[PDB]
From a paper:
In Gram-negative bacteria, Fe3+-siderophore complexes are recognised at the bacterial cell surface by highly selective outer-membrane TonB-dependent transporters (TBDTs). These transporters bind the Fe3+-siderophore complex and translocate it into the periplasm. The structures of pyoverdine, pyochelin, citrate and ferrichrome iron complexes bound to their respective transporters FpvA, FptA, FecA and FhuA showed that the ferric-siderophore complexes were bound inside the barrel adjacent to the plug domain, a position thought to be poised for translocation. Pseudomonas aeruginosa, a serious opportunistic pathogen, does not make enterobactin but does possess a TBTD outer-membrane protein PfeA, related to FepA, that binds and translocates Fe3+-enterobactin into the periplasm. PfeA has the same two domains (22-stranded β-barrel and N-terminal plug) common to the TBDTs.
We constructed four mutants R480A, Q482A, G324V and R480A-Q482A (double mutant) to validate the observed recognition site. Each of the mutant proteins was purified as described for the parent protein, and crystal structures of each were obtained. These structures were essentially identical to that of the parent protein, which confirmed that the mutations did not affect the folding of the protein. Co-complexes with Fe3+-enterobactin were obtained by soaking for the R480A and Q482A mutants. Apart from the mutation itself and an additional water molecule in R480A, the mutant complexes were essentially identical except that the B-factors of the Fe3+-enterobactin molecules were higher reflecting a bigger mobility or a partial occupancy of the ligand. Mutant R480A showed a typical low affinity-binding curve profile. The weaker binding at the first site is consistent with the higher B-factor of the Fe3+-enterobactin molecule observed in the complex crystal structures. Two single-site mutations (R480A, Q482A) of interacting residues revealed weakened (but detectable) binding in ITC experiments, behaviour predicted from the structural model and consistent with a genuine-binding site. Reduced binding of siderophore was reported for a K483A FepA mutant;33 the equivalent residue in PfeA is R480, which our structure identifies as binding to the siderophore and shows weakened binding when mutated to alanine. We further note that in order to form this binding site, the protein undergoes the same conformational changes for all three compounds and in Q482A and R480A mutants.
Residue numbers in the entry: 24 to 721
Amino acid sequence: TKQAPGVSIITAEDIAKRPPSNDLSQIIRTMPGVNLTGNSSSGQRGNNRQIDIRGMGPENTLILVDGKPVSSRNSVRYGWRGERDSRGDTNWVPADQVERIEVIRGPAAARYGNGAAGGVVNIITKQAGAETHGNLSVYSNFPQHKAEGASERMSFGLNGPLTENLSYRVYGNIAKTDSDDWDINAGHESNRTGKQAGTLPAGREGVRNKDIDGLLSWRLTPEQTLEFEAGFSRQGNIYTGDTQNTNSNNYVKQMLGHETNRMYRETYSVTHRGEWDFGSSLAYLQYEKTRNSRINEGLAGGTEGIFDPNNAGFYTATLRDLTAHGEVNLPLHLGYEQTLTLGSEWTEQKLDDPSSNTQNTEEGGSIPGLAGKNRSSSSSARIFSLFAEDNIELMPGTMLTPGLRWDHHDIVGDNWSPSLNLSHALTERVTLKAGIARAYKAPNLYQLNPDYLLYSAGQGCYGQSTSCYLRGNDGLKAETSVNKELGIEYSHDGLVAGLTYFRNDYKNKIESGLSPVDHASGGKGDYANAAIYQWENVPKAVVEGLEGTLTLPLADGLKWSNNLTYMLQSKNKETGDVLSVTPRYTLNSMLDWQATDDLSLQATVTWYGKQKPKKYDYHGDRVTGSANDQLSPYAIAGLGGTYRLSKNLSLGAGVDNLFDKRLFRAGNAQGVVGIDGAGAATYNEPGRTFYTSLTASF
Ligand SMILES: O=C(N[C@H]1COC(=O)[C@@H](NC(=O)c2cccc(O)c2O)COC(=O)[C@@H](NC(=O)c2cccc(O)c2O)COC1=O)c1cccc(O)c1O
Ligand SMILES: [Fe+3]
């Protein structure tokens, strides 16, 4: 099946029948347990939603490509409210060159370590065969409303041998998603008066992609395989007015329709793969270098995350990420039949950010231990990791899998992430799964850095209206989560029915602090001697919910599939406010008709449950008026087909959002001075959209 308890596979065939515009988040998000959310509840950068597993937020969703981490979003400033001006890390690999996507949720994911507390998404690429194969894929959509940005996508692939013991695979992608019109939210915006009269919450950012990958596989012996690959990708945006607080100035307007951020992502990887009688061996070296070039933004209050007109022009943040991994796999014949895996991991994150550490102390007064100008640009962390998995068969059908992961973070210290996963054949048709693990989150290099300094004159300060600083804190503990899950699945002759309960107990969630630790000295007028908050560890939080799947073969030619997410609870146990904003539930429903040998037809519906905003503003006080707005449940329906013209040529065509259900970003969730809040109404849902596709392959 494509759905076991805790796990989902998306195949190449699935990608082709529900083609994504551009980014894979579109299809990844239809798996059980998966939402498309921001990281916290501000609604800041709310059209920049990313993959969330079990409401643990997208910082706790680890993206791999062929088992190798993507860290590129770690190059974008992490803001006061736990959001980056980032589109996330699911748009580096082009849809049509993906063989399959693996989603691993909760206790089964903890064994991957740092940032898998929600889960792992592993995007797997198509590889060389015994012969040469290749493809040319093109997709083009056509929105009903011209405001909304159309998408165009062209990707090739080409793989095969060179010698009897040398293989290669290459691909390249060129794609563009046009931005929404600067004015798409006009007449839908929250009430904006005084200085902020005229301001707009923005529609979806556009992006231009250029992806090129080369791989050489070398199997110099029957038992021994050696892979070298390099990756070059480039995303440039099309700016449509997006700003942290939905405030505007003249620089912002100058940049409507222009590239204001570019990400270059370069990966080189060496991978050796061993298979001999004693068992299996795998080790890799990845060097990921990300250049995040964007227009300077301010770091104070309502100037946080708007283009700074006094310091016009681009800066470039640089992320050098180094990953090396070793594992072996030992069949053991013992008093119980089992398979043992032993592994080290080593990672280094260097971050050079020439912008984020430039907030100065002239207004709020100076901060003992923090230089007011020319602070370091530099951050780094090394994690060393050892782990073993023991995959024990107690009696045929049953598996017990205990694993220990230990990590040395060179700042935060030692972490112990133990795990245990049971699966039980009760019947040849019914399987019970239970799992309890403690997953791991190392603080990000922004949270961790005492040189990283934000300021507010009050409006953003917890439990007061006075000026305050927020400061990085190298004293922070790692976030840990005891991810529990209990689940049952019936499977027999493509009849699949399964339901999982999950509870993640969340300890030391890192977040802008609630109490001043200190007070600065000096500065100007009423703002002088500002309060100092740090990034704190929140003692306790909880997420809880249900994952369901049901697959019925109506007839031979015809398959009815459903995936269900239901979010029971999401609670910061300190403040009692929500962690994420998700829909209460999500049901994805596909009907797949194999109408002919050659013609396949697809109907889909997605139902989103109610969405409620945060109860408390940045002060910790209760929000009022349009800050309380909720989004009603709504559904999006679609038809598509694929008509195979030959072994060499297939055509696709369809319609997303048949009944043109549309939603509009009204702004951020809470009121500020002159900008009423928009509650849960923080993103744009696109309208009816026709799409066509063509795939030629040998
Ligand atoms: O969303 C926030 N602002 C809005 C709304 O804020 C306002 O409209 C005013 N604002 C306050 O009255 C305020 C009264 C008491 C305390 C304030 O902080 C006020 O801002 C004026 O500030 C501004 O116009 C700008 N602002 C600064 O230049 C600033 C410079 C340095 C330091 C600042 O604090 C600044 O605001 C932009 O502010 C905005 O657009 C916002 C969020 C998070 C934290 C904030 O502080 C925000 O203000
Ligand atoms: Fe302010």
